[PDB]
Structures are given as structure tokens and as C-alpha cells.
Design a protein around this ligand. Structure first.
Ligand SMILES: CCCCn1cc(CCCSC[C@H]2CN(Cc3c[nH]c4c(N)ncnc34)C[C@@H]2O)nn1
Ligand SMILES: CCCCn1cc(CCCSC[C@H]2CN(Cc3c[nH]c4c(N)ncnc34)C[C@@H]2O)nn1
Ligand SMILES: CCCCn1cc(CCCSC[C@H]2CN(Cc3c[nH]c4c(N)ncnc34)C[C@@H]2O)nn1
Ligand SMILES: [Cl-]
Ligand SMILES: [Cl-]
Ligand SMILES: [Cl-]
Ligand SMILES: [Cl-]
Ligand SMILES: [Cl-]
Lengths: 273, 273, 273
């Protein structure tokens, strides 16, 4: 039975789209999630919506309670999580407005708990060393890629996201350096969200929309909040459409072996006395 | 009305130089600054002096209250901040004793709050994503460069500072890696000082004096505290002279458009509910 | 008088090997070490054995009390520390089971105290900026290399360890990036252990045993806890044999000048008011 957690879903919380809408404020061993969980059916698939920075956005990416968010989604029975994120492009070929179905990350965060198994929570006892060779769920990504093609969307089938601590944007020297490291897009939220989802045995995938060229690129306006917001206003409809069309495809795909292997990977990553 | 905050201005607290001296301890919403603020006029420009690691004090760069320092300077009405820092050279051409008017940074810090807008201070509400394409005030840097030329100083008109967490110096593998990333000089304090100044709408620039070659030469003597102190004793007079001669040039330059654009950049970087 | 601290010392706590075995639970100004100190003589050299993650314990590398561990060893009179660590190989030529006598590191940790001189401790007043040009004791490394050759062990005479925060393993994009930085092996514990040992004036060296190829081969099976444990089970004796044969060579080598220079380096790295 699939249940899809949706983070950043802007704007699936719509009475025309979400049937049987119900709201829930949960607590977790790691504190309160960023917002209420919004439950319902989208195209007859059970979904759980969670706004990442709250309903009226008051949280720097550094302070988002990623642990509580993922724990809550796991506790609701989510088998999948699909997230949407804006990002900067570090490659000429990834133009603003393009979607990138990211398949790797590079962590540049510093302040962030990245495990449930922190020695202080008896619902997550021991030490977990989760594999990150393939951080994003391949089958979900394939569906996203296929669906984007059908919709005629500008879409890149792979990409490496560098997640910076923020909340500042990168310097130009940083932007150039990230390019030499192999990063293709840049954001502030993929890590540790993706890591925690893997620990929880959840199939996680990300829809990244490029909104700017960061500040590496000749002749473009360098990134700012207004440049990001402007591109999202002109393009964010694309991510919503991609998600809407993807959800029922996930609902009608077979998952038991994928989910079993994720469960095993998570279980056998934990060391006990 | 220009007012120049000066960090690491050691020798400017001199009765021959600083007229109308007052000392005071300020408190801020982010705690106490590193030292008392010393107010006065240098060459008929209002200045505010602030020792970065305390007057005598024993504080690692990781633990300097950068937020309080910049907030305090902002609250005193500082329009500009000019800082002096020692640094290691990562380039043969940047010799010990040389000044570098840095124009970029690479952040290698991990422990450091880099924003005033942390969700816990009602004088800095919301989330701020400050642009860092050009972290240092161009007009102040131009004055510094011009003044250094007039003084006959060996001075590099640009350079990328990598700021490490410290307090340890870098390994040789780190030193070589920083060179490959495009870093030219290395220190422990530029980040997050530069970032916070930009959030506060302050024109920030840095005078970096090379004191050593870090450890990327295998044949040459590596950096140590004694090597740094020795070079500063033999050269620090240069940074003082540069600052002294720069201050009245800043006092007599037009700033209203520069400061307006900084104010706008800072204001429109803030997201609210 | 040499005394060798041994961290991760794979089966040296054996009544056939360790003469005069004594167990001791110590406290330090930085808290409790990871396990009891086990004191005794191995081949007539005073040794102090310390398990890094505890005897029956389960603690993330982020939370190991490295300060207490090194302080305790220093307080017992250790002149040398030899550590064993598992690691991932980032180079084809470093095969699982191979030993690497590492000579450099790259720090990718974020959460970790790296100094005793933190402004809050009795025995460690001031600020310490320890040189890290040569983090590992050259003479100990030479003995390790020579001894490995005599034993017929597959052994690499140098290597750069990248230490990641963990507890997660690296992504494939991270693994590839570390290769481009010049890292040869990867672990979670070298930093800050090596840094703190240098601050304490201790001759520190590391025996790294490769257990996997991380995840930088796309065709090959990526690292997991089970893959690491399997390789360790298959390679259980090598590090012990190397250490056993190395210990008396360290005992019969001259150290007074090496230790004097380490003491001086540590002492003159400290700044006071
Ligand atoms: C199609 C996804 C829509 C969901 N959504 C809404 C928003 C609100 C936008 C607030 S602007 C600041 C955000 C954007 N966000 C991503 C981003 C874009 N460009 C970047 C760059 N050059 N460097 C680093 N990060 C970025 C970072 C910041 O939190 N973000 N994602
Ligand atoms: C030009 C006037 C500067 C004023 N002033 C005095 C002092 C006292 C310095 C105490 S020595 C340790 C400091 C130096 N300082 C800069 C530095 C120099 N070389 C570096 C290198 N290779 N790697 C990293 N950082 C450095 C870092 C340390 O806190 N610092 N600034
Ligand atoms: C077969 C019994 C041996 C007893 N035993 C258990 C242990 C604990 C090992 C648990 S596995 C996870 C550890 C390994 N250890 C080193 C390591 C190896 N490969 C790495 C890689 N690719 N990336 C980062 N680190 C590593 C890190 C982690 O704590 N050590 N000795
Ligand atoms: Cl983001
Ligand atoms: Cl880094
Ligand atoms: Cl510094
Ligand atoms: Cl290779
Ligand atoms: Cl390790």
C-alpha cells in the first residue's frame, strides 16, 4: 500500500486536487515538524503533505527540523517521499526553468543532525551507517523522467546537488569551486532530508527546479531572493504538473521488492552492542 | 555621515592618532562583543575600534562572537567596516609582508552562525539570503588599492581568502587542495564577519597581510605561531599606515548611492510570512 | 622512557601478550574516555590500550570523546600513540586488506572539538594553533613501513586520509570529489585524534586497513557495514602482527630529540594574554 509524503509540494494543497483533506499536528522524539501534516488522496493515492519551512515561512534551512519531518512522515506510513526544491544552476545547459531529477549530492552543510541514531533517543538505539552510493530512489526517478518527457518539460535525467549550509548564497569563488567538484545544481535543503529518508527505509526522490545561475556566469543577473521568486512565478506550475501526473504512476507501480531492499539496507546499517 | 568600524586596528588606539577617545561595553541581542568599543576621530573621521580576540584575551576564532561584533558596530551607526587580518600565502607571488585587498572568499568554517535572521531575535525577523557574488565593498577596496600604491606598498589588488575553522593550521594535503580550489590566502576570521556585515548593510573591506606560506612548500619552513608573530613585528606598521591614510579618503568620498544599494540588497534578501 | 598508547589495538589485550595487565577507569577535565585504560608491558615496552568506541558500546564517530581519550593517554605518560583504523579505499591500487601508513589528512568533519585549549579548561589555558604540515610522526611511520615489509604485508608507504563526519557513508558524488582532492583513503575518526595528539606533544601514527572501495566504482558493490565487518573478519591478524613487531622497535629507537621538538612545537603554538 503506497503512501506518498510530499515536501514543498506548492500547490497540491488545493481542494480541486486533494480529496478528503485532513490536518494533523504531530510530535516526534526529535521535536515538532515544520508544519501540520495534511492528509488526503490525490488521484486516488494516499498522500501526506508537509511544508518544509512552515505555512508562512519563518525558518532558515539550517533550522528546519528534518529529523522530525521525516520521522513524522515515516510514522504516518509513508513508503515514498517526493520533494520539490528550487536550486541554482552550475551548468550552462541547465537553464532557469529546467527541472533536474537529481541522482547525487555533495554535502556542504555543517550544522545539521544527519541521523536518527544519535545515542539520545531510545526509539533509535545504536549507531547507523547508512549507505549513500545511490541516495535517490531509482524507480521513482525513472517515473519522474518518463512523465516529464510526456509532458514536454525541459528536464535533465541526472544531476549532482551541492547543499550549502546557508542562509547566505555562495561567493563567486565558491560557485566556481563547486563546478570543479562536479556539482551541477545548488540548494540548501537536500541534505540531510535525503539521508534521513534512507535511514527510515523510505523511497526518496527530488524534483529540482533551476531558478538562477548562482553567480558563476558571465552576462546573467546573479542570484538573489527576488530572482528566485520571479523564476518560480514564471515556472513553478511545471513542478506541480510533473508531480500531479507522477503520483498515480507511483500508485500503480509494483514496490514490494524495492521497499524490502530499502528496509534491509536500513536495518543492517545499524550496529548494536 | 561616514563612520568607520575598525576590527584588528591594534595600533590606531593611540592618543597621537585617536582624538576624543571614549571606551564602552555594549550588549547586543546576540550577546557581548569581543571587547569594548573605542570611539573617536581619526583624521577627522568618526571611527569605532573593536579588537577581534579581546584586548588581551584568549579566544579561538571559532568562538569570537561575530554577530555581536557586527551588530554593535551597526548600532553605533557604522557605515563602513575595515578589518585587518594576518593570513598565510598560498601563492609564490604573495610574499610574507605583502598586503592583499581580498575580493572573494571560500568558506571552510563549520561552527559559525552566519546570519542575524535566525528565527530567535525579534530585531531580525524572517529569513535572510544575502547575495555573496561580490562579498567586499568595491569602492572601499578601490580606495585601499589606490592608497597602497601611493604608499609604495607591495599590494595585490585581488585575492580569494579561504577561511578555515581552526584553531589548528592546515595539513599539507589541505594546503595543496585549497590551491587547486583557487584560494590565494588563508585565515580563520573572514567568514562570517564579511557575511554579517553585508546583512547589516555595511560597506565591508579587508586588509590581509601575508605572514607565511602556510605549509605547501615542502622545502621551506612551515607556518607556526612564532613565524606569524615574527613577520607581523617586521611588517605590521604597513597595515596601520594603509588604514591611517585610507580613513580620510573614505571620509571625503561620496557614499549615498553605494550605501543605498547595500541597504536595498540587504532589505530585499529578507523573506517574511 | 617510551610508553605507547594504542587505540583500536585489535587483540593486543591478551594474557599471552600483555604482561602485568592492569585495568583503570580514569576521568579527565574533558570527561570520561571511551573505555578503561588497559596497562601493561608488551615485549618489555610499557603500553596503554584504549578501545575507541568502547568495549561493548555503540557511539557515532561524531560523539567519541577524543579529547578525553588523548588527555588520558597523555596523563598516563604516553610518548607515542599508534592507532589502527578501518577505512575505505579511494584508489584501485589500495585493495581491501591492504595497510596504509597514512601521512596526511583532509578534514571533512564539522561537529568536532579539535583543541584542548577551548577557553574553559584548567590544564589548557590560552589559544593553541598547532602546525599540521606533518601530522603523523615520521620516525614511527618509517618503523611501521619497514616492519610491514619484513612481515610480507601488503602496505602503502603514504596516503591521505579524508575524515568525514558520518555516521552516514559518502555519496558517489562525494567519493569522486574526494578522489579529485587527492584523498586516498576515507574514515570517520582520524580527525581530530591526530590534531589533539600533536597538541599534547605525542608522537602519533596510524595504521589504516582498507575494508572496501567506498562507492566510487559504479559496477562494484558499494560499502556497507556488513561489507566492512566481512573484510575485517577476513583480515583480523595483520594489524595486530604489525603492532606486535613494531612495539619493541619503538622501544629500542632513540626519541629524545623527536620528543623535544614535538614538546617545543606544542608549547610555542600556545598564545597567552
Ligand atoms: C519548484 C519548487 C518550489 C518550492 N519552493 C518555494 C521556495 C521559496 C523560495 C525562497 S528563495 C531562497 C531559497 C531558494 N533555495 C534554493 C536556491 C535557489 N537558487 C539557489 C542558489 N543559487 N544557491 C543556493 N540555493 C538556491 C535556497 C533558499 O532557501 N523554494 N522552493
Ligand atoms: C596586520 C595586523 C594583524 C593584527 N593581528 C595580530 C595577530 C596575532 C596573530 C597570532 S598568530 C595565529 C593567528 C594568525 N591568523 C591568521 C593566519 C596567518 N597565517 C595563517 C595560516 N597559514 N593559516 C590560517 N591562518 C593564518 C590565524 C590565527 O588566529 N593577528 N592579527
Ligand atoms: C568483524 C569483527 C570486527 C570488529 N569490529 C567492528 C568494527 C566497527 C565497524 C563498523 S562499519 C562502519 C565503520 C567503519 N569505519 C571506517 C570505514 C571503513 N570504510 C569506510 C568508508 N567507506 N567511509 C568511511 N569510513 C569507513 C567508519 C564506521 O564507523 N570495527 N571492528
Ligand atoms: Cl533549498
Ligand atoms: Cl568542505
Ligand atoms: Cl584570522
Ligand atoms: Cl585509482
Ligand atoms: Cl573510522
Amino acid at each position: 500500500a503506497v503512501k506518498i509524503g510530499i515536501i514543498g509540494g506548492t500547490g497540491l494543497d488545493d481542494p480541486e486536487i486533494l480529496e478528503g483533506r485532513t490536518e494533523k499536528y504531530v510530535d516526534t522524539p526529535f521535536g515538532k515538524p515544520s508544519d501540520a501534516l495534511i492528509l488526503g488522496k490525490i488521484k486516488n493515492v494516499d498522500c501526506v503533505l508537509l511544508a518544509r519551512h512552515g505555512r508562512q515561512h519563518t525558518i532558515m534551512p539550517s533550522k528546519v527540523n528534518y529529523q522530525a519531518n521525516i520521522w513524522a512522515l515515516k510514522e504516518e506510513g509513508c513508503t515514498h517521499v517526493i520533494v520539490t526544491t528550487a536550486c541554482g544552476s552550475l551548468r550552462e545547459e541547465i537553464q532557469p526553468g529546467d527541472i533536474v531529477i537529481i541522482d547525487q549530492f555533495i554535502d556542504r552543510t555543517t550544522m545539521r543532525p544527519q541521523s536518527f541514531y544519535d545515542g539520545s533517543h531510545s526509539c533509535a538505539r545504536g549507531v547507523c551507517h547508512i549507505p549513500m552510493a545511490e541516495p535517490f530512489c531509482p524507480k521513482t526517478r525513472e517515473v519522474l523522467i518518463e512523465t516529464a518527457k510526456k509532458l514536454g518539460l525541459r528536464c535533465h535525467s541526472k544531476g549532482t546537488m551541492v547543499t550549502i549550509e546557508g542562509p547566505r548564497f555562495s561567493s563567486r569563488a565558491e560557485s566556481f569551486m563547486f563546478r570543479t567538484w562536479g556539482a551541477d545544481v545548488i540548494n540548501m535543503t537536500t541534505v540531510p532530508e535525503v539521508v534521513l529518508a534512507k535511514e527510515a527505509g523510505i523511497c526518496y526522490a527530488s524534483i529540482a527546479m533551476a531558478t538562477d545561475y548562482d553567480c558563476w556566469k558571465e552576462h546573467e543577473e546573479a542570484v538573489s531572493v527576488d530572482r528566485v521568486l520571479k523564476t518560480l512565478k514564471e515556472n513553478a506550475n511545471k513542478a506541480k504538473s510533473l508531480l500531479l501526473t507522477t503520483i498515480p504512476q507511483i500508485g500503480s507501480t509494483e514496490w514490494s521488492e524495492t521497499l524490502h531492499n530499502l528496509k534491509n539496507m536500513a536495518q543492517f546499517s545499524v550496529l548494536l552492542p
